[PDB]
Ligand binder design. Sequence first.
Ligand SMILES: O=c1[nH]c(=O)c2[nH+]cn([C@@H]3O[C@H](COP(=O)(O)O)[C@@H](O)[C@H]3O)c2[nH]1
Ligand SMILES: O=c1[nH]c(=O)c2[nH+]cn([C@@H]3O[C@H](COP(=O)(O)O)[C@@H](O)[C@H]3O)c2[nH]1
Ligand SMILES: O=c1[nH]c(=O)c2[nH+]cn([C@@H]3O[C@H](COP(=O)(O)O)[C@@H](O)[C@H]3O)c2[nH]1
Ligand SMILES: O=c1[nH]c(=O)c2[nH+]cn([C@@H]3O[C@H](COP(=O)(O)O)[C@@H](O)[C@H]3O)c2[nH]1
Ligand SMILES: [Cl-]
Ligand SMILES: [Cl-]
Ligand SMILES: [Cl-]
Ligand SMILES: [Cl-]
Ligand SMILES: [Cl-]
Ligand SMILES: [Cl-]
Ligand SMILES: [Cl-]
Ligand SMILES: [Cl-]
Lengths: 302, 302, 302, 302
Amino acid sequence: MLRIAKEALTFDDVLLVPAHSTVLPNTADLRTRLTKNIALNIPMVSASMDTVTEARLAIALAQEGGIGFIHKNMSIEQQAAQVHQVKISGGLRVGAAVGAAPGNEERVKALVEAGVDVLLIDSSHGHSEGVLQRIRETRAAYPHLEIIGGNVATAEGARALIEAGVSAVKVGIGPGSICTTRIVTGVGVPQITAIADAAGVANEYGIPVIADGGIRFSGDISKAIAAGASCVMVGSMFAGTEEAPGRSYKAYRGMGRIAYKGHLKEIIHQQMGGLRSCMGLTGSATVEDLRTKAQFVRISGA
Amino acid sequence: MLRIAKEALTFDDVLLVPAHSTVLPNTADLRTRLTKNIALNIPMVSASMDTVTEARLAIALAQEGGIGFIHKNMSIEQQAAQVHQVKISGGLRVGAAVGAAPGNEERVKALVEAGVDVLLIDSSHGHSEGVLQRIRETRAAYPHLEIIGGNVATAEGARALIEAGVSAVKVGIGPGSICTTRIVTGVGVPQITAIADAAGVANEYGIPVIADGGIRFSGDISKAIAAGASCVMVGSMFAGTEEAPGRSYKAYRGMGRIAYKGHLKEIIHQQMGGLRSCMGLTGSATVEDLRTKAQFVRISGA
Amino acid sequence: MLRIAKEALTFDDVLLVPAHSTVLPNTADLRTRLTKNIALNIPMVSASMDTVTEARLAIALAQEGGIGFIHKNMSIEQQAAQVHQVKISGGLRVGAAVGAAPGNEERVKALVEAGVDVLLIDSSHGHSEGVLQRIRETRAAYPHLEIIGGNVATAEGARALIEAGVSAVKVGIGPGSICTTRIVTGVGVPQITAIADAAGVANEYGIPVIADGGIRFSGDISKAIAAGASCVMVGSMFAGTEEAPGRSYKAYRGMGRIAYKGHLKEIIHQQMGGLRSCMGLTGSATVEDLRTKAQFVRISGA
Amino acid sequence: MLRIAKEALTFDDVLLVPAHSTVLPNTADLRTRLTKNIALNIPMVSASMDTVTEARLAIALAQEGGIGFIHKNMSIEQQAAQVHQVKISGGLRVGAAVGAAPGNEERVKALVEAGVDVLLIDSSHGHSEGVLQRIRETRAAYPHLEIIGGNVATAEGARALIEAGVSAVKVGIGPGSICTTRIVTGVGVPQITAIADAAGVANEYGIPVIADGGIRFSGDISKAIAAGASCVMVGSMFAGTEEAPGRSYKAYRGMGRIAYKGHLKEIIHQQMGGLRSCMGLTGSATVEDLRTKAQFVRISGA
Ligand SMILES: O=c1[nH]c(=O)c2[nH+]cn([C@@H]3O[C@H](COP(=O)(O)O)[C@@H](O)[C@H]3O)c2[nH]1
Ligand SMILES: O=c1[nH]c(=O)c2[nH+]cn([C@@H]3O[C@H](COP(=O)(O)O)[C@@H](O)[C@H]3O)c2[nH]1
Ligand SMILES: O=c1[nH]c(=O)c2[nH+]cn([C@@H]3O[C@H](COP(=O)(O)O)[C@@H](O)[C@H]3O)c2[nH]1
Ligand SMILES: O=c1[nH]c(=O)c2[nH+]cn([C@@H]3O[C@H](COP(=O)(O)O)[C@@H](O)[C@H]3O)c2[nH]1
Ligand SMILES: [Cl-]
Ligand SMILES: [Cl-]
Ligand SMILES: [Cl-]
Ligand SMILES: [Cl-]
Ligand SMILES: [Cl-]
Ligand SMILES: [Cl-]
Ligand SMILES: [Cl-]
Ligand SMILES: [Cl-]
């Protein structure tokens, strides 16, 4: 009667199962892929948000083995110069975001001319035909440009993005800490099922999946990876750091205030320490082992 | 052993699934049906409550494309005059409510003579034989009058109302924000299952279903429609507005105080903006697409 | 692997389903049975607790159509005299409780000689052999005495009580508002499943089931009856009334303080008004209709 | 798609079912086994934590019929002397913990020479090859030494420990009140399923299982035993007692403050009183009856 496609699971619905292990946390290999052709030293990227990622944060994150996505709420001169700034600070990679509306061609051109490593075409709805069309137009114009498209939350959405020409699929409709999509629209898919459904398709093509939204604790990063993600995208977790664009707070807002957190490097150290522990507990030598072989148990939340 | 008919779902048990879309929010078509023969420009109607709907609110809502139901807790002169007031403010439609007890014939006659577009026969229990009898008596007396009957929460209740002669079925036993039915009586059906069960029957006859109770957020409106409703009836959401009959509050009570909310037009704008977004995300060009083709996922609430 | 007998449901797991009805709340028939041979005008009895039932409350409740159980924490003279007090206030019925330990014979004799209508043999564990033995000894000694035995929470426990000679089975292990059994012992059965399992057996013999514990709201009374109970036993709900043995409170304690509630008659009126409403909504003309024909839906608690 | 091994249950997901009983709480037999060759008078052991167990607590617990595990965060002289202290206070048994890193041989030798009854090889991950290797090395060196290995949370982990030479398997990954494993790593198994899976294997060899972590209330002890554990290990429950190493608190920290609790003997008395009650309710004459024959119901947590 009611058209229910299936049950869907979020981070708090599952735990990872410990397994025989020869991995110690300090020996775990955190290397992974952002896109088909771009490797990362750690599985973390920053959100393309005007309170999270500008050049300073992008530099800090790349030095720690991640990549930042310069947000689009700035002029092209400003966004190209930020790209260039990162590129000259010693062979660092950088991304930049553009919207999916028509008229973005000059922004894309400037970013590409500035040496951007990866273009993110950011949308609240990656399965929208206008998004697919922007990706197809960009891929035709720039046959060798690494392109992330998103966000999707289904197998069919991931397949559509891949067939539009993306280099990586970004997943997340509903899960972000801002919570407006779900409440305002009634649309979303719990993020563990969303990642798995997208990865089920993406794996067939060797296309990485990026898990975007809902990461609160380092345990969520492990679960996101085990569900099939190659890396995670975080906004709230890095907002309020020194590097982000009677107590001290910084603005965090949807594209609210967050308590000051100090320097990004310590946050990243704590988060990856958790991941390293999980890899020791699950016997995962590499991110790929975690992503393809670790097992979950479903829990009640009692 | 225990006589359990089935499991039943409420709004918080489900999310809508994003889908391929050529719909933009500004292009979504919000037109729908209130009854077999009455169209609405937006899928919203107001509750027949003495703290929610009198002439002023009914006028404001009709100007925005909805319809109001003038409550019955007033004399006939008063209720007929309120009907007339709305009708003369420029070709606006209006409803009015009457109780299901015997002796309502003169009230119904006066409302009909005042030009009421739709008569609501309101009951806490639409599957009661006394209600069915009042609907049958009214339908026989006024063969062409649009009549809403309710409330029901089951397939069998919807079928009984239709067989009594209603023009639309109103659903909701248990879900209203007042919460007394469930707590006091132990009776109710979670509203997403209630809407779907009623729509399963009503669809066979082209009879609209009105989802009444439990709408807190614009996301609930989308879900109600996707479960099979043609429009939603709201009480709490409009109570406390300027138009409803050291902080400022208005009474909201069952047939309690609610913080002042300003003008109805802004509320309606925000609520329909959410619905338009959901339609963009689900690829629903029209209310009918959302109502008949969108899909849900079941969630745990973790 | 894990020895799980089945899933079990409490009051908050279920709702009653509305049904076709010719019953109005004021026409509902609240008569029921306490025991095989004792009728009640309403389905309520009071707990045998030293902060709930002495003669004054027992009188008030019997005048409203219920029956009270004089608690045992008093001497025999005191407990017999309390029995007699109720019996002389105009043809009122009364119960009295005794413990299940050996040595209760003189207490039982005195109660029987005082005219007690029903003897309650009260235990936290009715399936204990010592309890069954006390019931068997009492039944042999007093072949015509109405005897309630309890508490049990299973089919097998109900069958054992019946085979020991009880006139009614009292159900409840775990559900009481005091909550110590569950927390301290880890033992219990959710009360809706407990009632149904016990009634499944008891019905085969025409033996009533009394639902004891966990009743918070009048909705719980309806659900208890629909699960198979003939009446409900309440402690917290009547504790703190005028009649029970800078704000005003009375002691409520396990065999804590409760806010003063005024007179018992108003409480009973409100509780039975809820039940009458439920019977109108479910089309239950009599307690037996509710107990044997009404249907539930299972809910998530979202 | 998603690699989910199964659903898993914690203490709050289940209740024990009452059963026919000839057991009174005062007649229940609390004797059990710690290891293959070490009996206990009550099923309780203390955690090897630097805020829970040193000689004073170990003595007090052994006098009540349990055994304590002297923690390792002290020198060998200190840890051997603490062992000796307990051994001379009148034929008391004592355990001691060592880490699983290489270099522990002299610590183990000193503990064994001091008369330690049981060696605990403590790890957050008992299925780690380094742990299995330390157990195998210890078993080869000390063919007759009772050795506890842990912690594991799976059948396969329990089997690995047994095949490494342990005398008892300790279970718990994720359940401890400190909660860091789950949150930081995303790894864990709900403790009732973890105990049952481990006991399913261990039972085949007559090897006891020790349930470690998550015990808050005496009801949890009963459930842990019924799930298959022979005894429980507690940290938080004994931290803050007089004997543990403007209000009064003691440190409780992971290997935080806890309110002062008075003397250990009263805590143990209350906890075992709950267990005795559960055994009366379930008809379990002995710990083995509870561990192998009692039944659970699954509950929703409403
Ligand atoms: O519900 C939303 N309302 C918004 O206004 C919004 N803006 C961004 N995003 C998305 O949230 C992601 C970051 O989520 P977290 O704060 O949980 O890391 C981001 O990376 C986006 O995918 C939004 N989600
Ligand atoms: O539980 C209830 N006790 C009452 O006294 C009551 N009065 C009205 N209604 C119903 O609630 C609907 C409006 O519900 P919301 O405030 O959730 O919009 C209305 O449209 C009615 O269907 C009641 N429900
Ligand atoms: O957990 C418990 N600890 C106690 O000390 C206790 N004493 C009584 N009872 C039982 O609770 C019933 C009344 O429960 P309510 O307050 O929910 O009506 C009573 O009728 C009893 O069945 C107890 N339960
Ligand atoms: O999540 C954890 N973080 C820690 O730092 C930690 N240290 C000890 N343990 C384990 O917790 C057990 C005691 O748990 P309880 O306080 O629940 O009795 C102990 O017996 C250990 O198994 C830890 N768990
Ligand atoms: Cl999608
Ligand atoms: Cl989520
Ligand atoms: Cl109905
Ligand atoms: Cl609902
Ligand atoms: Cl029982
Ligand atoms: Cl219960
Ligand atoms: Cl394990
Ligand atoms: Cl747990």
